[PDB]
């Protein structure tokens, strides 16, 4: 019930971890680097920010969310001096099994099934449900930020990267309590996009000639123009399509909420959803 | 066309046997029974210190008064009391007690699903009038729904306009924001309670505040088991988290469960047991 | 890729036989007929005193003209008139009358729900083009829906961009209301189409009430044989909460607008009523 | 030189037996007793939602804590609770009850004037420390004066710093209203001590009688109570804030400074109370 708060360490991180001058330099350059504990040889990941207001917010919000085990665990935070400047060094449990879609795509010809889609969506949404229950919107939930702990077949999938996260707030109706300004609802848009990609292998909005954002692509996003083409959507439920339809709603306030998402039959009873085979792994493997 | 509000300036005791000590509780913010001098018939008195809010309250409540589902104001006095200018509102006396406490005093016949609907239809009548003239009540809770008398044929009325606001300042949007919609939230909560006997959100011992914010609530068994998905869906539309997703009072009033109370089954509810106990 | 608006600055009478009387008329917001001099072919003229709002309209109308369900601008002129700079707009001449004028020059042949559907899809096509290039018309009423001619294959076009606005400054749309009232308008027009009078109407502070409140029914006789699928669709377009309203994409993908040849040919009181 | 405040970050439950039945209660204002895990010794717990207001309280209170007439802060935790961030303040447990709570239980006529003086000296010493480090408590009311133990000479202590403000950022002092609030309150309290009811009350015009500063020293109650005291009270209760004496002037007031020399006449306080 009561959760310990963030103690940012001030000692040098190289005390506790074999950090090189090499990786450390890729770190400020945004790279996320694998480093090793020196007591144990256990491996971890290091993300490096320059101590600034935004960086502080990231660490604080991520620290809160770390309680939930579908979110990547922060082991320690350092505030050290590097290149004269002061910066935050975040050490996480190392997620080593790769990005969500990489796993799926490199696995043939073991089909991905709709049921694996549902299980995967059930656990992302659990993470989002936790974040919204404490008034954080992640606001950057994309495939690049969902990684598997290990290649182990039972690896668990975790949400990463909180540099866009925001506190959603500083007979009584809910709005009466806090601002309604809607960052929580784009986490919901994002679930929609991931769910969509999981069932077919490609996103609902895309570029043809590819692959940067198209002006065509932006219009289609803004219009809300997408379809459920054959061959890849033909065995998928109408119930699943309707669910994607509610999440990809253009009007944010028309969008389903995480509580409604989690109570949806398809999410709530993954283990009952058919193991209908999908084109996801082929489409994905085909790049 | 209805009459404007005329605040009477002469001392209220010119006209009502008002104790000086009723006046003393009156100031604390108590509604008090008082009597006419000619008629010797009983009325209700609440007292406000004259200020912009009180002026707003009398003003909005007065306009609302045309609706008979709203407690009637007999007249309004502006008197000096304890040195200050302050507002004295005389109302019809609502002698029936509050919505629930009535419902829990019971045992003869069964409080049925149909009684719930008829009740929700009349609170809805009140709300629909308010909103149609661009006032939002904003404090529609049970303690503000009183029965006229103790007769079975008592008529339920809405009270306390201390939080009311004008929502006003072709597509309907070209001709307000979020005030009207919490009246509908409230209708949701009240309707929920009318059907089972407890509220949809509650403290079991910040959880409750979270559950409201997330919109986590059940339709638990046993007591919700006889209620249809139609009624469930209507409550779901009202308890919507995002205000703009909520039903408007016009849609509510045109919902078949409300519009056709007649046609709704007199199936027994657990409301009265739960409430008593 | 299509060309930009090149506003001509030469005297318009160099090109069209425009009389001083029509210029005077056209100054008063009347739309007038003129003729090319090379060709003697027929056109429509409307005159705005040049000002930033007049400039907005021309700029937006030009953009939308790309789409053939929008009246075509053929030339824009900036000339002096009464010593004031002003804009003269030459459009394709729409000669088939207003949408509802044609329907009520019918009886007593049927006007069916299916034809209703098709007309609606037609207007919808205009609105879809606008929105997708971020323009809201904001004046979609019946008298801005004129037909090209009275030939059987005349097309219905949207006119009058005097209230038009740019709606504009794994990523949500709200990142990359005007449009939503266009859609309230589709509902009004659709509602009228299916029965022959408006959903809200004069009876005026009382009518502003009925609008704000959403107060309208689907009375009989006239709505009795009309399909529930339609009534639901109107119910969404006419929603009081704008964000609750359906979008133009969602409108064009609706089975009633999409698959017309499975909306029944059920006859409507529309022409009979429009007449009376 | 005393140590600064070292807000701990580990679960408060690593150290104390904070049954989750207390959190949700303590989180809305209740002060709950808890126990140190290793010593089982009991303590009190106050929980604030972590904000600048809250952080101000802990800091000012930590500073006041060196004065043994302020309740002592044992330590302060910062923890996530229900995903919100909040400060957990662990104090020495004051288990003797509210100052007046005890005086009630006195036997009619037992509580003396000499006692009242000794108490006011005692409350007085707290105010004096606060003001001398530029803190004004601003909520010195009876329910914030609690007794340590129940022992006969258990020491009385000022609690609750939720309203405390720093009264600041040949020379004249002014060249360097909040403290004067504290001195009014010593006045009301001193008054209650001597008769058993306040100078302002109802049987409201009570907001006029304060503004007008109209109160009496009614008999039978006030009849044998000295005049130098009545006069002390009349300064403190001055309507005009600048007219009130300071805490230094109060600590040097003979009735305060030399309680020894003040006679033990009985008051109707207990009975009345
Ligand atoms: C030799 C490869 O070195 C590795 C090995 C494993 C990781 N793990 C990982 C990586 C690659 C990482 N990459 C983030 C980069 C930014 C987008 N989201 C993914 N973030 C996290 C957070 C916790 N671990 N983790 C990173 C680098
Ligand atoms: C039937 C539609 O087929 C298409 C046609 C084109 C694309 N384009 C494309 C594809 C195939 C795509 N695939 C990503 C899916 C998620 C993993 N990374 C690859 N991502 C993007 C981003 C912008 N476009 N784009 C995708 C699917
Ligand atoms: C013994 C007579 O005491 C009475 C008798 C009847 C009433 N009636 C009543 C009462 C008790 C009353 N109470 C409000 C108090 C504040 C909460 N909402 C209800 N408001 C109104 C408005 C019109 N009447 N009425 C009040 C007191
Ligand atoms: C049996 C369902 O579980 C619960 C759980 C908690 C409660 N709580 C409770 C109950 C029973 C309750 N009941 C009142 C509802 C309004 C009319 N008078 C009774 N009001 C409130 C407000 C906050 N909680 N709370 C009641 C039932
Ligand atoms: C005798 C010729 O008179 C005509 C003949 C045809 C037209 N055509 C027409 C007319 C009558 C016209 N009238 C607008 C007037 C303002 C309301 N919206 C319709 N607007 C347009 C735009 C393109 N053509 N067109 C106008 C006048
Ligand atoms: C069954 C209700 O019948 C009525 C009664 C009155 C009206 N009023 C009216 C009617 C009948 C009406 N009829 C047509 C005028 C020509 C364009 N389409 C609508 N237009 C307007 C515009 C403003 N009001 N109004 C409409 C329908
Ligand atoms: C639940 C156990 O019962 C106790 C036993 C002792 C306490 N002690 C106490 C209590 C009751 C307490 N109560 C505050 C409540 C708010 C008014 N000021 C006094 N404040 C303090 C500060 C230091 N201790 N202490 C509180 C509760
Ligand atoms: C000789 C006058 O005797 C009275 C008569 C009435 C009062 N009223 C009253 C009394 C007796 C009073 N007594 C409390 C004093 C503080 C300790 N708890 C008891 N407190 C308050 C607060 C507001 N009024 N009020 C006090 C004294």
Curated annotation (Swiss-Prot), chain A:
Positions where Phosphoserine occurs in the chain: 214, 270
Phylogenetic placement of the source organism: Eukaryota, Metazoa, Chordata, Craniata, Vertebrata
The reaction(s) this protein catalyses: L-seryl-[protein] + ATP = O-phospho-L-seryl-[protein] + ADP + H(+); L-threonyl-[protein] + ATP = O-phospho-L-threonyl-[protein] + ADP + H(+)
Oligomeric and partner information: Heterodimer with p38-alpha/MAPK14; this heterodimer forms a stable complex: molecules are positioned 'face to face' so that the ATP-binding sites of both kinases are at the heterodimer interface. Interacts with PHC2. Interacts with HSF1.
UniProt name for this protein: MAP kinase-activated protein kinase 2
Positions annotated to bind staurosporine: 93-95
Portion held of the full protein: 47 to 345 of 400
Species in which this protein is naturally found: Homo sapiens
Residues that bear Phosphothreonine: 276
Main function: Stress-activated serine/threonine-protein kinase involved in cytokine production, endocytosis, reorganization of the cytoskeleton, cell migration, cell cycle control, chromatin remodeling, DNA damage response and transcriptional regulation. Following stress, it is phosphorylated and activated by MAP kinase p38-alpha/MAPK14, leading to phosphorylation of substrates. Phosphorylates serine in the peptide sequence, Hyd-X-R-X(2)-S, where Hyd is a large hydrophobic residue.
UniProt keyword annotation of Transferase present: yes
Keyword check for Chaperone: no
Domain (Protein kinase) ranges: 18-267
Post-translational modification: Sumoylation inhibits the protein kinase activity.
């Amino acid at each position: 019930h009561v959760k310990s708060g963030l103690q940012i360490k001030k000692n040098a991180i190289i005390d506790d971890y074999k950090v090189t001058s090499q990786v450390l330099g890729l770190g400020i350059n945004g790279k996320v680097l694998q480093i090793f504990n020196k007591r144990t040889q256990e491996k971890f990941a290091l993300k490096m920010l320059q101590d600034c207001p935004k960086a502080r917010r990231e660490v604080e919000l991520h620290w809160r969310a770390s309680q939930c085990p579908h979110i990547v665990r922060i082991v320690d935070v350092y505030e050290n001096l590097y290149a004269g400047r002061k910066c935050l060094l975040i050490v996480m449990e190392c997620l080593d099994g790769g990005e969500l879609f990489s796993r799926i795509q490199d696995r043939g010809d073991q089909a991905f099934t709709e049921r694996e889609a549902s299980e995967i969506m059930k656990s992302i949404g659990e993470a989002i449900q936790y974040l919204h229950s404490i008034n954080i919107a992640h606001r950057d939930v994309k495939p690049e930020n969902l990684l598997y702990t290990s290649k182990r077949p039972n690896a668990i999938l975790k949400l990463t990267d909180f540099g866009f996260a925001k506190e959603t707030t500083s007979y009584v109706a809910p709005e009466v309590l806090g601002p309604e300004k809607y960052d929580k609802s784009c986490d919901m848009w994002s679930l929609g996009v991931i769910m969509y990609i999981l069932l077919c292998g490609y996103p609902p909005f895309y570029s043809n000639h590819g692959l940067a954002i198209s002006p065509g692509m932006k219009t289609r996003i803004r219009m809300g123009q997408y379809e459920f083409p054959n061959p890849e959507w033909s065995e998928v439920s109408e119930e699943v399509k309707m669910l994607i339809r509610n999440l990809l709603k253009t009007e944010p306030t028309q969008r389903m909420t995480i509580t409604e998402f989690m109570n949806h039959p398809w999410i709530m009873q993954s283990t009952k959803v058919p193991q209908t085979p999908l084109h996801t792994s082929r489409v994905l493997k085909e790049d």
